[PDB]
Design an enzyme around this catalytic site. Structure first.
Site, PDB file in Angstrom:
ATOM      1  CD  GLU A 242      55.820  47.729  32.599  1.00 27.00           C
ATOM      2  OE1 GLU A 242      56.760  46.907  32.542  1.00 27.00           O
ATOM      3  OE2 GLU A 242      55.224  48.141  31.583  1.00 27.00           O
TER       4      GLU A 242
ATOM      5  CD  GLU B  99      20.938  47.190  47.995  1.00 25.11           C
ATOM      6  OE1 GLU B  99      21.758  46.344  48.413  1.00 25.11           O
ATOM      7  OE2 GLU B  99      20.627  47.307  46.792  1.00 25.11           O
TER       8      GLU B  99
ATOM      9  CG  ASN C 173      33.813  42.963  53.983  1.00 25.42           C
ATOM     10  OD1 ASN C 173      33.721  42.090  53.126  1.00 25.42           O
ATOM     11  ND2 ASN C 173      32.756  43.473  54.603  1.00 25.42           N
TER      12      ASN C 173
ATOM     13  CB  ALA D  33      29.730  42.084  48.354  1.00 27.07           C
TER      14      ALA D  33
END
Ligand SMILES: Nc1nc2c(ncn2[C@@H]2O[C@H](COP(=O)(O)CP(=O)(O)OP(=O)(O)O)[C@@H](O)[C@H]2O)c(=O)[nH]1
Ligand SMILES: Nc1nc2c(ncn2[C@@H]2O[C@H](COP(=O)(O)CP(=O)(O)OP(=O)(O)O)[C@@H](O)[C@H]2O)c(=O)[nH]1
Ligand SMILES: Nc1nc2c(ncn2[C@@H]2O[C@H](COP(=O)(O)OP(=O)(O)OP(=O)(O)O)[C@@H](O)[C@H]2O)c(=O)[nH]1
Ligand SMILES: Nc1nc2c(ncn2[C@@H]2O[C@H](COP(=O)(O)OP(=O)(O)OP(=O)(O)O)[C@@H](O)[C@H]2O)c(=O)[nH]1
Ligand SMILES: [Mg+2]
Ligand SMILES: [Mg+2]
Ligand SMILES: [Mg+2]
Ligand SMILES: [Mg+2]
EC number: 3.6.5.-
Lengths: 430, 427, 430, 427
Positions: free
Chosen positions: C245, C62, C219, C12
């Protein structure tokens, strides 16, 4: 500022809205794709550059007419989230449109209305288009109107409804829905305009000599009525009528908000040349019992308050002359407690004509909306049909099986009875 | 979106359903191979109501073809448009009911019906928002009547909130095909009273009479009868499948025509119907469609409406039509014939108008009428059953198959109750 | 200066990094092969002559997921030292990614990060991308954040996660890994943004009207959010938000550092034409429950601090107007101990559109980041899944079969119990 | 790189392995001579998982061909794609196990396991990063069952951290081919329980049921059954051999489907499986793959999943598909069938998606399910073993070459214990 939102519920509401929006696009010069090659800010919101989206919403529990809109010539006018669609139709059932099928689609349409209302800064009110006969147009209209009442509150709520005719009707279970929707419209509506399909048919047959008119002519006439309603707000005139002023002048008592709309002159092209259509004669034709778009007899009724909306080449002095002549006619009588009962509105711009329409171009036009007691008889025979069908408990199970009880059938019946009693006791002499 | 699952039971049901699928593929422009060759987008904007999108831009019917003889299955597959159906929907046994409602409802149909339930279950789950089922079956045989009745009971148990349609052909006293027709009819009507949302009473007498006097057809075979029934079936759902000025799905007709739950037996009708020689001598207008609908000869059940009172009437119009004159015609019909309409229901006629007409005609109308004249169609069946029941005639087949005489007694009591309620709502 | 290092671990993380680097190359004008045909110094380091190499690192246990990157369109953007592959996948095991496989790859990623950080002179911090359900994205991320905390220390560590959904889940042992990784993410992450795949799918279904969205759209949305976060470093605007900040405004307590991301307007091409994408309406759309990037209802939670990152054609006065309208809405609630809870940054650079993307070109965009108590029930349901699978000791033999102990699971569960108690006691009124 | 060493034991194992190498070489574009002639470059970066690099751009499988009868390897070599194998990987005796677990495990298995282990040692040391082994065998014979169990045990002491994958055809009560099936099956399960990381319980009965009702195949030979098993074997390693949106190697499926070490008997399956005439009418989307792969008729074991509870299931999807649709379909399966899934394991489904589909299809799914229905498949073998064991039937054979009664008793006890623990976790 000075905006108003149109809501179209049911097949009748959606088709009337299609006619209304075609008429509005013709009026403001906006093409069907939204581009206009000011005053249009009432009904249209300008998005980005050269794109106007109507301040409307289309709601149905069936996908036929909404998808017809989505594939029609006005598919570019509305964004897809503006047209809300269900899956299974209410099927002429107030129970289905109010409890079972209306509950899972009310939240989304209210969200759309919220996102359409905060966009404008001067929201005058709402225009709900529906019909009393349909299950959707009764149940979901009642649900949406009560939700709007609890949400917005003091905002004006004007609704246009297709009241069933005494003889011309196309639904068997119609009186049940018609009683039930009015049971809540009595308190959740500010001004309910009433229209009978049979009266539109009679006007089309006599005035416009159309032998075979269909629903498109009916929706064109209703669109002309709504355009005459909103012209005083979408343009400038010698006398301007706003929605709040309209309600104040037309509604004498909170439960008495069911005026009858008439429109004149509604004539064909060939019959227009021979007629010198003056202000006085169209004003007289407004009070003609044959020109009312509700199948009722004003002669046996009594007028309480009427609003005269003029558009075109109209000056106030001939309007005063016409009103004075109307007062001198004994066949048209008014209630004693209303010594002056005419709200006058003059607009400079004349009513436009839709291409392919049956109406002819006219210099002047009048849309009178009179709150009279002639609709007590309409309520009377609707109630007689309701009682006569409810004595045998016919079709009652088709409502009981969908989250609904006979007790509220009886309460709607007695609420209607109180309504006729109210009209009777306000129609008496003092 | 309001899709309909079609089921055919028995030989007559299978043939009627095959003809219905042929005419509805013609209406939607689907070739016998299943691909789309229509011209208007309206033929595909509601294609999911009856067809499932298969891979390759082609369509298969949402139909399950059920019988107990493989011969009818082979006949349906081998004919025109018979390849369009999905092969696994063809559910059949090997023995056959043999005109035994018991063999169709208790032993052999019961053994087979699990596969039918599995197929209708996967069909109902594959589709998006199912609204109901429709079944085509007979009442004289054992396969159609008995096994379709079992299927209706199972479907109603599994889908109690969906609408049931049964274009069921009822036996008639003059054209009586078999000897045990009233037994089968009474046993089927028992569960059709409560397990079906609405039932269309058709019979071969009225169809033959139409083909004789209306169509002026010299030697009509079963094909013309099946075509008439198919046209009525298509006109019932044309509002679902096409837009219109006033839409009316099957649930709307159900709520507008069934005042009380047990009165849902209708006489179907179709207009216009003209012979070839009289086609040019007849006017294309709506009042003559109304006259053709409301006269006794066009009814497709052997019940004369003049002997009874109309409770509720449906008129599903098709084509570019005017609403004012349609409403005026219905008003004149209800006014000139106030004696033939029930008095405690104002506006006995519900009108629906669709814009897309059937192929080859620019205007058509479908009559669906709920009248008390249906009661005599059950009187004749009940008296034939009572004649054979006093003498225990032909009962040994059903008794040996597993039934009992008390089942017959209570089925007769149920029909007698229905007849009595129709009579006392006729007044 | 103001450089940031992006770490992509797990499948991911690597795919989201591919999306992010495509987006950044489109934004800064970098071609996929590394030549520009300034402001790119935040993420890209110019090397030699006309070559920009991103300050990234791609680590997975992998080879294949790195391998389509090594042979894809962006094979020349990188060089094989920040693309790191192991031998065997962690196999949805936190234990395998943390102890058995992580130990022989942690040094190489650590010194690659060292050589990537000593190159820049103004390193603000790190961006770590992963999931909680995966074995690598939990275990190896825990190990890597241990090393980063013990090495760099005061340097910021921004964290992007793919939280497991309440229902849309693809790993059976997912709650185990999710509970195990947070026990170190608590004390080793300065700020941890959450994204839930089910919420992103539902957003793509409604707003972006995609029937069938894959991981690439997910994504794309995540990359848009990260670009909106880092646009202040990569560009200039009226109000700029640095990472330090950002943390100071968004993190009230050291344990409470789990804000919720959202993006607006997420619309398709055809929906953009009819939409008036004003500042107020996108600000409102940020707070409504349906566009939350994590499946959780903020209505029954209470906000603590919201960071509004405006970008595009935005001026501060309408931002103040929108915030004022938000403060008056009763539905949106804020904790009493935060009188002002809006840190606002406006950037001039509009959000770019990736070719082939589902997002429409818009003038303005908001990435609102809210630290709220609405994540408490998500963590509670994760705990319910965890102790459901833990009452039977299911799948635990895989984790303890390499060198993990039962005490690890017990201490992770009590740590989550303490964290839930912490949110309960910090959301309570005073 | 994540190499797999393939071993085939017995005639059935060698046949299924030959078909598996057929389908794998089809997937990777390897000709009958072993040289690459594919089109896509994706067929070569993961060629080492099953193949070794020979001189001259030649690919040889990582397969060990084990049997006692030389005729099986003669047939394998003489068939198609059979010369691709390494000549010295073929290992054979001269006698044959004679449907005896005892001779396949003690008296003539042992002299051959030395050579087999030498060959597999050479293959394992040759490969770069081993991940596990694959064994194909059947439990009915003595070579397959007995010697494959022995080989699995030897590999386990030699490679305990590598994954043990076996594809085992179990005997069935209907399809029974040898008389001593219960003995061999029980003795083989006694060692597959504790010596294997995952066992795919194949059986001929379910394969024949597929070839009857699903594929509508008139005369299914062993070729078609082996084709189905080969399709499943390719599906379980597609993620190893090809990229994808979600990648799941053998170890990931093992960790996601073995809550407790002894419950590693999985019920495999494949989708879509369509008849030649019926594939033309079938929509091909993710939901129909899902409904096919979860259907009890599609399953490759003689045990109904509806009779038990799914501990875990795996959906190794292949082809370009949307992840929302896949995950949502898994969600719907888990919700509407909550009674068929274990309550103490939320998210019972493990989902993986590859992008390279099998040749001729654009998407495919391999169903793997760890259900509690294996208990009855093992109770059948247990009761047959008990029936043949009270009367000492055929025990003189197994006792003739070293075995004793206590070994049979402990094998039966182990199988009974495993059945009891499946029952316990079924609840
Ligand atoms: N209108 C039609 N009636 C038909 C048709 N075919 C048969 N029938 C009539 O239906 C009645 C018998 O129905 P079927 O022959 O279909 C009896 P079914 O097969 O359902 O039961 P079994 O014969 O016991 O298997 C009888 O009056 C026939 O003349 C047809 O195509 N159309
Ligand atoms: N699915 C398949 N089953 C097969 C195949 N060949 C055999 N078998 C089945 O395997 C079962 C017994 O396995 P085998 O005949 O291969 C016995 P094996 O050679 O392993 O041991 P021995 O013959 O005793 O040395 C029996 O039911 C056969 O019908 C095949 O190609 N596919
Ligand atoms: N004037 C006019 N009336 C219409 C039109 N269309 C439908 N109606 C009226 O609407 C009534 C029925 O309600 P519909 O709008 O058709 O249906 P609905 O409101 O969606 O409610 P359902 O019956 O549940 O579908 C009929 O009695 C008609 O009189 C129209 O185009 N013009
Ligand atoms: N949004 C999004 N989530 C993804 C993507 N790929 C994987 N995931 C999520 O990652 C979770 C599991 O972790 P993976 O990324 O698949 O695997 P990993 O991080 O490499 O760790 P391993 O399990 O050892 O492979 C799943 O639950 C997915 O929801 C992606 O491309 N986009
Ligand atoms: Mg409607
Ligand atoms: Mg028959
Ligand atoms: Mg991975
Ligand atoms: Mg052998």
């Amino acid at each position: 500022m000075r905006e108003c939102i149109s809501i179209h519920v049911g097949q009748a509401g959606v088709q009337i809205g299609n006619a209304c929006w075609e008429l509005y696009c013709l009026e403001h010069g906006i093409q069907p794709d939204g581009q206009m090659p000011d005053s249009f800010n009432t009904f249209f919101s300008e998005t980005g550059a050269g794109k106007h989206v109507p301040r409307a919403v289309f709601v149905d529990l069936e996908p036929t007419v909404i998808d017809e809109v989505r594939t029609g010539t006005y598919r570019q006018l509305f964004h897809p989230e503006q047209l809300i669609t269900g899956k299974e139709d209410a099927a002429n059932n107030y129970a289905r449109g109010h409890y079972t099928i209306g509950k899972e689609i009310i939240d989304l349409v209210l969200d759309r209305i919220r996102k359409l209302a905060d966009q404008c800064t001067g929201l005058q009110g709402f225009l709900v288009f529906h019909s009393f006969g349909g299950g959707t147009g009764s149940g979901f209209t009642s649900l949406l109107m009560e939700r709007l009442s609890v949400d917005y509150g003091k905002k004006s709520k004007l609704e246009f409804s297709i009241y069933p005719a005494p003889q011309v009707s196309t639904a068997v279970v119609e009186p049940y829905n018609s009683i039930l929707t009015t049971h809540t419209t009595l308190e959740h509506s500010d001004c309910a305009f009433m229209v009978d399909n049979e009266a539109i048919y009679d006007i089309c047959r006599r005035n416009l000599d159309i032998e075979r008119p269909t629903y498109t002519n009916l929706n064109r006439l209703i669109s002309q009525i709504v355009s005459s309603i909103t012209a005083s707000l979408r343009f400038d005139g010698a006398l301007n009528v706003d929605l709040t002023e309209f309600q104040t002048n037309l509604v004498p008592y909170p439960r008495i908000h069911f005026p009858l709309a008439t429109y004149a002159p509604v004539i064909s092209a060939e019959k227009a040349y021979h007629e010198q259509l003056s202000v006085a004669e169209i004003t007289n034709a407004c009070f003609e019992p044959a020109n009312q778009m509700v199948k009722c007899d004003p002669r046996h009724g009594k007028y309480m308050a009427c609003c005269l909306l003029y558009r075109g080449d109209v000056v106030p002095k001939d309007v005063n002359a016409a009103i004075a002549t109307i007062k001198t006619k004994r066949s048209i009588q008014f209630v004693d407690w209303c010594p002056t009962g005419f709200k006058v509105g003059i607009n400079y711009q004349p009513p436009t004509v839709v291409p392919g329409g049956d109406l002819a171009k006219v210099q002047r036009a009048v849309c009178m909306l009179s709150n009279t007691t002639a609709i007590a008889e309409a309520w009377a025979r609707l109630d007689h049909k309701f009682d006569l069908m409810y004595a045998k408990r016919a079709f009652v199970h088709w409502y009981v099986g969908e989250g609904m009880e006979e007790g509220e059938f009886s309460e709607a019946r007695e609420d209607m009875a109180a309504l006729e009693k109210d009209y009777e006791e306000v129609g008496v002499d003092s | 979106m309001r899709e309909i699952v079609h089921i055919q039971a028995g030989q007559c049901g299978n043939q009627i359903g095959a003809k219905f699928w042929e005419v509805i593929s013609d209406e939607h422009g689907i070739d016998p191979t299943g691909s789309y060759h229509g011209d208007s987008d309206l033929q595909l904007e509601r294609i999911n109501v009856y067809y499932n999108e298969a891979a390759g831009n082609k369509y298969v019917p949402r139909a399950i073809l059920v019988d107990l003889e493989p011969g009818t299955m082979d006949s349906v597959r081998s004919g025109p448009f018979g390849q369009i159906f999905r092969p696994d929907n063809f559910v059949f046994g090997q023995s056959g009911a043999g005109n035994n409602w018991a063999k169709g409802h208790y032993t052999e149909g019961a053994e087979l019906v699990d596969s039918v339930l599995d197929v209708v279950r996967k069909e109902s789950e594959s589709c998006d928002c199912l609204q109901g089922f429709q079944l085509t079956h007979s009442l004289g045989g054992g396969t159609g009547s008995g096994m379709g009745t079992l299927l209706i009971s199972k479907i109603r148990e599994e889908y109690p909130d969906r609408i049931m349609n049964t274009f069921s052909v009822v036996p008639s006293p003059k054209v009586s095909d078999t000897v045990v027709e009233p037994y089968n009819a009474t046993l089927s009507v028992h569960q059709l009273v409560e397990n079906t949302d609405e039932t269309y009473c058709i019979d071969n007498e009225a169809l033959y009479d139409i083909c004789f006097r209306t169509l002026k057809l010299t030697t009509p075979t079963y094909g013309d009868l099946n075509h008439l029934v198919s046209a009525t079936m298509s006109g019932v759902t044309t509002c679902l499948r096409f837009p219109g000025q006033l839409n009316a799905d099957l649930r709307k007709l159900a709520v507008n025509m069934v005042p009380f739950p047990r009165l849902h037996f209708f006489m179907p009708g179709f207009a216009p119907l003209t012979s070839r020689g009289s086609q040019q001598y007849r006017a294309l207008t709506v009042p003559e469609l109304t006259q053709q609908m409301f006269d006794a000869k066009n009814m497709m059940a052997a019940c004369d409406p003049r002997h009874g009172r109309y409770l509720t009437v449906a008129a599903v119009f098709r084509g570019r039509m005017s609403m004012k004159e349609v409403d005026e015609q219905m008003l004149n019909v209800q006014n000139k014939n106030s004696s033939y309409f029930v008095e405690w229901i104002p506006n006995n006629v519900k009108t629906a108008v669709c814009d897309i007409p059937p192929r080859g005609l620019k205007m058509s109308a479908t009559f669906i009428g709920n009248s008390t004249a249906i009661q005599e169609l059950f009187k004749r069946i009940s008296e034939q059953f009572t004649a054979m029941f006093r003498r225990k005639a032909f009962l040994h087949w059903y008794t040996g198959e597993g039934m009992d005489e008390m089942e017959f007694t209570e089925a007769e009591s149920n029909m007698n109750d229905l007849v009595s309620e129709y009579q006392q709502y006729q007044d």
